[PDB]
Design a protein around this motif. Structure first.
Motif, PDB file in Angstrom:
ATOM      1  N   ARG A 414       1.034  -0.931  -0.594  1.00  0.00           N
ATOM      2  CA  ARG A 414       0.454  -0.262  -0.248  1.00  0.00           C
ATOM      3  C   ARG A 414       0.849   1.105   0.241  1.00  0.00           C
ATOM      4  O   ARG A 414       0.460   2.371  -0.944  1.00  0.00           O
ATOM      5  N   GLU A 415       1.656   1.361   0.990  1.00  0.00           N
ATOM      6  CA  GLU A 415       2.349   2.862   1.155  1.00  0.00           C
ATOM      7  C   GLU A 415       3.355   2.448  -0.513  1.00  0.00           C
ATOM      8  O   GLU A 415       3.618   3.753  -0.489  1.00  0.00           O
ATOM      9  N   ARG A 416       3.907   1.038  -0.385  1.00  0.00           N
ATOM     10  CA  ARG A 416       4.268   2.108  -2.253  1.00  0.00           C
ATOM     11  C   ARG A 416       3.998   2.471  -3.733  1.00  0.00           C
ATOM     12  O   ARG A 416       4.357   3.069  -4.181  1.00  0.00           O
ATOM     13  N   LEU A 418       1.974   3.916  -2.299  1.00  0.00           N
ATOM     14  CA  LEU A 418       1.265   5.675  -1.914  1.00  0.00           C
ATOM     15  C   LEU A 418       2.771   6.143  -3.279  1.00  0.00           C
ATOM     16  O   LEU A 418       2.973   7.757  -3.763  1.00  0.00           O
ATOM     17  N   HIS A 419       3.917   5.529  -3.154  1.00  0.00           N
ATOM     18  CA  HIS A 419       5.178   6.007  -3.634  1.00  0.00           C
ATOM     19  C   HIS A 419       5.233   6.757  -5.027  1.00  0.00           C
ATOM     20  O   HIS A 419       5.494   7.539  -5.378  1.00  0.00           O
ATOM     21  N   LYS A 420       4.274   5.434  -5.844  1.00  0.00           N
ATOM     22  CA  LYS A 420       4.260   5.662  -6.670  1.00  0.00           C
ATOM     23  C   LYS A 420       3.381   6.049  -7.708  1.00  0.00           C
ATOM     24  O   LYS A 420       3.462   7.367  -8.234  1.00  0.00           O
ATOM     25  N   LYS A 423       3.943   9.846  -3.493  1.00  0.00           N
ATOM     26  CA  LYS A 423       2.862  10.362  -1.688  1.00  0.00           C
ATOM     27  C   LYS A 423       3.218   9.557  -0.513  1.00  0.00           C
ATOM     28  O   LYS A 423       3.938   8.224  -1.185  1.00  0.00           O
ATOM     29  N   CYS A 424       3.991  10.223   0.771  1.00  0.00           N
ATOM     30  CA  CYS A 424       4.844   9.146   1.019  1.00  0.00           C
ATOM     31  C   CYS A 424       4.272   8.977   2.690  1.00  0.00           C
ATOM     32  O   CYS A 424       3.619   9.999   3.643  1.00  0.00           O
ATOM     33  N   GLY A 425       3.790   8.039   3.528  1.00  0.00           N
ATOM     34  CA  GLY A 425       3.070   7.775   4.302  1.00  0.00           C
ATOM     35  C   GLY A 425       3.371   7.251   5.863  1.00  0.00           C
ATOM     36  O   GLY A 425       3.423   7.471   7.526  1.00  0.00           O
ATOM     37  N   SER A 426       4.716   6.719   6.033  1.00  0.00           N
ATOM     38  CA  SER A 426       5.695   5.736   6.793  1.00  0.00           C
ATOM     39  C   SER A 426       7.106   6.239   6.831  1.00  0.00           C
ATOM     40  O   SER A 426       7.589   5.744   7.645  1.00  0.00           O
ATOM     41  N   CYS A 427       7.325   6.894   6.322  1.00  0.00           N
ATOM     42  CA  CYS A 427       8.588   6.767   6.048  1.00  0.00           C
ATOM     43  C   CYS A 427       8.997   7.432   6.522  1.00  0.00           C
ATOM     44  O   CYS A 427       8.874   9.217   6.369  1.00  0.00           O
ATOM     45  N   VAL A 428       9.942   6.978   7.954  1.00  0.00           N
ATOM     46  CA  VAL A 428      10.290   8.098   8.969  1.00  0.00           C
ATOM     47  C   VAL A 428      10.835   7.835   9.509  1.00  0.00           C
ATOM     48  O   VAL A 428      10.899   6.538  10.163  1.00  0.00           O
TER      49      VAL A 428
HETATM   50 ZN   LIG Z   1       6.466   7.001   2.234  1.00  0.00          ZN
END
Ligand SMILES: [Zn+2]
Ligand SMILES: *OP(=O)(O)OP(=O)(O)OC[C@H]1O[C@@H](n2cnc3c(=O)[nH]c(N)nc32)[C@H](O)[C@@H]1O
Ligand SMILES: [Zn+2]
Lengths: 852, 408
Positions: A414-416, A418-420, A423-428
RNA sequence: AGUUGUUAGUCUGUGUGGACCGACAAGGACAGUUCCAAAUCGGAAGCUGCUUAACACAGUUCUAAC
């Protein structure tokens, strides 16, 4: 008769040795050696003028008093307090006063960070001053005497002088003699008038009973004073304890410009991450205002929670107890206090934007370099099962668990996508289960998009002509030697101060230029990573407030996050380009004029590259921020223009003094080692790594990674011993200790818990075999620089560092303590075996011709 | 449950923030597993009260409450294990040892920890310390079932003619910690003078007062650190002034034992004090008023030295707990050691004093030293050494007088 | 408070200095026959069969007396 006066008298009744020791019982003391050296030399940056800086830091850190706005310091003295204060967020203008003159200190002009806003004034006694409007006040005035009455009176005069300055503002005032009644009463009246408490600073020596009255705090004066006095009394002898050491303070360098400091974050880019964090702890998201963050943008905080000496080794390396460095390595702390201090002094900076000419040069060089590096290999996406392999074969255990899990993978997908989208959701990431899945997932995404750098060895010595990825310690020596054979000037190895904090945006863009080679599918993801989690980073850190630890959320755009996958690759790349440019300047191809003009013609530089680049590259060994460079001529020891302009300042040398280059390659430091050459009995030569053993000993006396587990700590000791028998056999002490340990632990306790975290340690010693054979495999069989492959047969042909050389690298040979140890290691082992129990015990001592 | 934890040469500190079923849930299952694994086991408790609580929570499993006979797993107070170890009867070989309240401060407790650790190191033991604060803890604000609203304030030391309304104005029950019974009496008088039902607790009065506390009538409860262990309250606020007292050695020439004055508490103590509230996720107002910073170097206290005496005299050089190692002389010969055990057990002498006596080889009967003390070595009776414990309370003085007279 | 050491010897490096050179080795260390090293011998020098200096200048050499 108050207790304080009792102790004052009692102290007066002591002698030179007694008083000398008693003043240093169980107190923290900062190492001021290096600072003394640098100041005697005449340095201008990175140095606390006095011990005042640490002393004030101890208050400021705990927020007991918070500088703000205009800060006025009285009795500034050499000016430690003023300079320390200059480098703080809210501070704007610092003025320091002192009477100056004979028997009195004088301001020492320096240029540490924030110096441009500091006005120090000698020749002005504070007593006759027209009290000015102060936002923050500092006073450190005190003249001790054996007569308590004199100190009391001086204190009283001080309080009288400093009353008219407190107009609802943060303050810290020294109080020298707090145990005199009239003093106590005046303090109480002032407290009622203003508030604030009275505190003791652990730095202050035992010889005095000073305290400090501070703005932010409450409590009972009298009881606290009594507590201090009781402490001192209890500490008169108290079977005297040596004083604990701490690391001194740093103050950066350069002028400080407030208006250009704070950052404006691309809130649209990181907003989702910040919002998710805030939502996850929607209870404690209290935006603070004591956040000490100069250059990092701030987002909020939320409630949060929070070395050991291995017995097995400690029992077998007795003679090293008195060695200062061995102890010093142990007494290092990673508490929120330490981490905050490190962050303040190291990462909260801002590197000036470079000259346009430099930017164009770097752009050109980076393009050329990337094209070269891809002369044969071509990037590819990474794959999940590969990540599984990397995890399984080696937080490790939980990591295996999470990888073997399922829901994690859906989250990643899912986050991936998003990356495509972009946007980035949990990259911290954090500067050290659901949230932990998020973190591991972000690591996985980076691995997927940028793993080809490592899985395919883009930087191996064969492919990159300079990198040393995939070699390990036992080969860096040979590589260094082969460098030494190439004609040219001396060899230089300049360490860059805080490399990671010194990556400007242009460097990131250049590093991103690699996307000009991937395939669209891969390129989209790589762009995502680059532009969303590298160029706009979001970090959780810990901070202690007078309520507990809280996590703070910060963000920035520069300064690659040291925990990220692909950090090593990119670091090596940027370092390579930097050194290449420095060589360019050395060979004269680049001038100051070329740097200045916004558009220097590319033809000359490109010609030089395409003609001599590979040749120059073969003159280097690069690993992360560690560099070894051999230029053709020593003008390279002066090519400091471009280097400084790029913002990669060397460590521990003034900003324009030329580099200093060794000639004997057995002295050039590299990855915290140097390398020695040995002759075997057959005359076959070996190249082995050596570092001042004290570090080795300390690092094997630290049982981190295990709370309390003797079965564990013994195995760690055995692992350290085997590594010693494999990579440091040429040190006598080490070999003796290793043999002892190996004979002092069950012969079937397989070690674990990696002894080192360097990338240059293939860990051949984590096996359970018999050392001698493995030593043969490591150095004899599979060493390309070993023409004659005749195996050694016993630990007797294994060479030894020459006696004087071994002494010169920190060995304890020739000293009686070691002699007795050497004699009675048999009893020591017996005792340790006893402690262990009834498991088997082989004896490796007869391997040395001393125990046959 | 991680079954591997039951391997020998394995000692683990587990934890569970107050309640959590650490006793109410886990411990019976742990004993059940050990019984299924058929392991001769010991359990160590800090105090009689905690022992009774564990007895209540141990309904069904065969436990030798030190009964009928021929069990496998026994339960006893920690100091009991210490003394039984000191007495020259070969201590029973237990495979596994569970120890509660491991952050306790009794010298016998410290020595029990040391011995258990060393037995694990011998490779013939498995150890489980079930406590919420190990040696080396510094998190004075650890987890809780409900979050704890902290606040530093001006906790009064004596009775106040007026002010400090935040103390009394609370809507919820208040548990307040005091360093001595007298101070408790004063503050209780003041609080009742404001018409708030109050309840004072102490070392002796606990037996009669605890059940009254178990009723719901009271509102404001003052106590010393006795309530620090196993005292269910369902209160609302805690006032922990981070002031306390402790028996500390003091060298200052003549090395002696002195009951300290008011003093900031150890980090672990303050942790336990704060954790004496907020043991239910249903509640919210978990207010904690602190007015001090916990002590820095507790290395001056004496119970460390006494525990060293107990461990050294115990029948391989005896060694403490690793994290507590940071604080082989006190060991005595046969007759002197027997005398030390006697003076501790029969004469009720606190450990330091008994060791000092037994060092000089005075057999239990002889009481020459009790009057041979120097001029300043008097009391308000000249023992060779001074220990305020021997004369702190009138009851303590009476017992010490009985001992010195030869009536004990 | 901060600032802080001072004098003697020892220990490093240099310089002057004929100023040391070999032979051997008690003993020591080390554990690789690996390094030291008192004594002793011889050589040379100097003033007449005795000596191997002497001092200086700096060592972040140490040791002790304010
Ligand atoms: Zn991310
Ligand atoms: O920390 P600091 O104040 O710099 O130590 P000082 O040397 O300045 O001491 C100041 C304070 O201490 C007493 N004192 C100094 N030197 C002493 C000594 O050799 N013997 C005794 N008994 N006392 C000494 C002095 O009273 C002065 O006020
Ligand atoms: Zn070396």
């Amino acid at each position: 008769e108050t207790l304080g006066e009792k102790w004052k008298k009692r102290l007066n009744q002591l002698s030179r040795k007694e008083f000398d020791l008693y003043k240093k019982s169980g107190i923290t003391e900062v190492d001021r050696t290096e600072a003394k050296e640098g100041l005697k030399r005449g340095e201008i940056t990175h140095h606390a003028v006095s011990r005042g800086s640490a002393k004030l830091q101890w208050f400021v850190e705990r927020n007991m008093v918070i500088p703000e706005g205009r800060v006025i310091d009285l009795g500034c003295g050499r000016g430690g307090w003023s300079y320390y204060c200059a480098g703080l967020k809210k501070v704007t203008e610092v003025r320091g006063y002192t009477k100056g003159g004979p028997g009195h200190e004088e301001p020492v002009p320096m240029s540490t960070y924030g110096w441009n806003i500091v006005k120090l004034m000698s020749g002005k006694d504070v007593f006759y001053l027209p009290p000015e409007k102060c936002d923050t006040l500092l006073c450190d005035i005190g003249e001790s005497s054996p007569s308590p009455t004199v100190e009391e009176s001086r204190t009283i005069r001080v309080l009288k002088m400093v009353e008219p300055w407190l107009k609802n503002n943060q303050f810290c005032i020294k109080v020298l003699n707090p145990y005199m009644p009239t003093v106590i009463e005046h303090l109480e009246r002032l407290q009622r008038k203003h508030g604030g408490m009275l505190v003791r600073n652990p730095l202050s020596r035992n010889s005095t009973h000073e305290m400090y009255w501070i703005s932010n705090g409450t409590g009972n004066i009298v009881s606290s004073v009594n507590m201090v006095s009781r402490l001192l009394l209890n500490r008169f002898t108290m079977t005297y304890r040596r004083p604990t050491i701490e690391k001194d303070v740093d103050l950066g360098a350069g002028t400080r410009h407030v208006n250009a400091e704070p950052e404006t974050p691309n809130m649209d880019v990181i907003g989702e991450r910040i919002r998710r964090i805030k939502e996850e702890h929607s209870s404690t998201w209290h935006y603070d205002d004591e956040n000490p963050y100069k250059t990092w943008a701030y987002h909020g905080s939320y409630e949060v929670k929070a070395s050991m000496i291995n017995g097995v080794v400690k029992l077998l390396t007795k003679p090293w107890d008195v060695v200062p460095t061995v102890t010093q390595m142990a007494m290092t702390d990673t508490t929120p206090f330490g981490q905050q201090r490190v962050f303040k002094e190291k990462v909260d900076t801002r590197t000036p934007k470079p000259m346009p000419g430099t930017r164009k040069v770097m752009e050109i060089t980076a393009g050329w370099l990337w094209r070269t590096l891809g002369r044969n290999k071509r990037p590819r996406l990474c794959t999940r099962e590969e990540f599984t392999k990397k995890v399984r074969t080696n937080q490790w255990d939980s990591a295996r668990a999470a990888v073997e899990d399922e829901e994690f993978w859906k989250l990643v997908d899912r986050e991936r996508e998003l990356h495509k989208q972009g946007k980035c959701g949990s990259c911290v990431y954090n500067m050290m289960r659901a949230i932990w899945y998020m973190w591991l997932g972000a690591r996985y995404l980076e691995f997927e998009a940028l793993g080809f750098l490592n899985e395919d060895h883009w930087f191996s010595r064969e492919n990159s002509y300079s990198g040393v990825e995939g070699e390990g310690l036992h080969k860096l020596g040979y590589i260094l030697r082969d460098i030494s054979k190439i004609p040219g000037g001396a060899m230089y190895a300049d360490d860059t101060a805080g490399w990671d904090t010194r990556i400007t945006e242009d460097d990131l863009h250049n590093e991103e230029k690699i996307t000009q080679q991937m395939d669209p599918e891969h390129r989209q993801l790589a762009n995502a990573i680059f532009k969303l989690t590298y160029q706009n980073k979001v970090v959780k850190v810990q901070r202690p407030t007078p309520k507990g630890t809280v996590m703070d959320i910060i963000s920035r755009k520069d300064q690659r996050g040291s925990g990220q996958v692909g950090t090593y690759g990119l670091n090596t790349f940027t370092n390579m380009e930097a050194q290449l440019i420095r060589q360019m300047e050395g060979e004269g191809v680049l001038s100051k004029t070329d740097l200045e003009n916004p558009h220097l013609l590319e033809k000359k530089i490109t010609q030089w590259l395409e003609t001599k680049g590979v040749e120059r590259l073969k003159r280097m060994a690069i690993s992360g921020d560690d560099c070894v460079v051999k230029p053709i001529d020593d003008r390279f020891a002066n090519a400091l223009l471009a280097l400084n302009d790029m913002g990669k300042v060397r460590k521990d040398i003034p900003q324009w003094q030329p580099s200093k280059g060794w000639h004997d390659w057995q002295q050039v430091p590299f990855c915290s080692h140097h390398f020695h050459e040995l002759i075997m009995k057959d005359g076959r030569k070996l190249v082995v790594p050596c570092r001042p053993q004290d570090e080795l000993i300390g690092r094997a006396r630290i049982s981190q990674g295990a709370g309390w587990s003797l079965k564990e700590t013994a195995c760690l000791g055995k692992a350290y011993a085997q590594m010693w028998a494999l990579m440091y056999f040429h040190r006598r002490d080490l070999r003796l200790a290793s043999n002892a340990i190996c004979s002092a632990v069950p012969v079937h306790w397989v070690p674990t818990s990696r002894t080192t975290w360097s990338i240059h340690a293939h860990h051949q010693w984590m096996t359970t075999e018999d050392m001698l054979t493995v030593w043969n495999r490591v150095w004899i069989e599979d060493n390309p620089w070993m023409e004659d492959k005749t195996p050694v047969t016993t630990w007797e042909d294994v060479p030894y560092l020459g006696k004087r050389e071994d002494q010169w690298c920190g060995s304890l040979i020739g000293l009686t303590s070691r002699a007795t140890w050497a004699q009675n290691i048999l009893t020591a082992i017996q005792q340790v075996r006893s402690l262990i129990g009834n498991e088997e015990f082989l004896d490796y001592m007869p391997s040395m011709k001393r125990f046959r | 449950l991680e079954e591997e934890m039951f391997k020998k040469r394995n000692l683990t500190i587990m934890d569970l923030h107050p309640g959590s079923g650490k006793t109410r849930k886990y411990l019976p299952a742990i004993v059940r597993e050990a019984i299924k694994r058929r392991l001769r086991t010991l359990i160590l408790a800090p105090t009689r009260v905690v022992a009774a609580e564990m007895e209540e929570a141990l309904k069904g499993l065969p436990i030798r409450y030190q009964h009928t006979g021929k069990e496998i797993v026994d339960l006893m107070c920690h100091a009991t294990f210490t003394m039984r170890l000191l007495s020259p009867v070969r201590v029973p070989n237990y495979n596994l040892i569970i120890m509660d309240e491991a952050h306790f401060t009794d010298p016998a407790s410290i020595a029990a920890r040391g011995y258990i650790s060393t037995r694990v190191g011998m490779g013939e033991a498995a150890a489980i310390f079930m406590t919420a604060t190990p040696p080396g803890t510094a998190d004075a604000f650890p987890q809780s079932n409900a979050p704890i609203q902290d606040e530093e304030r001006d906790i009064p030391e004596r009775s106040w003619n007026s002010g400090n309304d935040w103390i009394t104005d609370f809507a919820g029950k208040t548990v307040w910690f005091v360093p001595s019974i007298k101070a408790g009496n004063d503050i209780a008088n003041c609080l009742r003078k404001n018409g708030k039902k109050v309840i004072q607790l102490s070392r002796k009065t606990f037996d009669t007062e605890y059940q009254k506390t178990k009723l719901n009538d009271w509102d404001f409860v003052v106590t010393t650190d006795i309530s620090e262990m196993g005292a269910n309250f369902k209160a609302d606020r805690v006032i922990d002034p981070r002031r306390c007292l402790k028996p500390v050695i003091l060298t200052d020439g003549p090395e002696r034992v002195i009951l300290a004055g008011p003093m900031p508490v150890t980090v672990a103590s303050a942790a336990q004090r704060r954790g004496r509230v907020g043991r239910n996720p249903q509640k919210e107002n978990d207010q904690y008023i602190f007015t001090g910073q916990p002590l820095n170097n507790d290395e001056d206290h004496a119970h460390w030295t006494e525990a060293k005496m107990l461990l050294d005299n115990i029948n391989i050089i005896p060694a403490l707990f690793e994290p507590e190692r940071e604080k082989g002389e006190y060991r005595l010969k046969g007759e002197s050691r027997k005398t030390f055990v006697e003076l501790m057990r029969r004469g009720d002498l606190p450990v330091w004093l008994a060791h000092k006596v037994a060092s000089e080889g005075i057999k239990y009967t002889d009481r020459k030293w009790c009057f041979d003390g120097e001029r300043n070595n008097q009391i308000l009776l000249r023992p060779r050494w001074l220990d305020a414990r021997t004369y702190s309370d009138p009851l303590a003085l009476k017992e010490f007088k009985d001992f010195a007279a030869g009536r004990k």
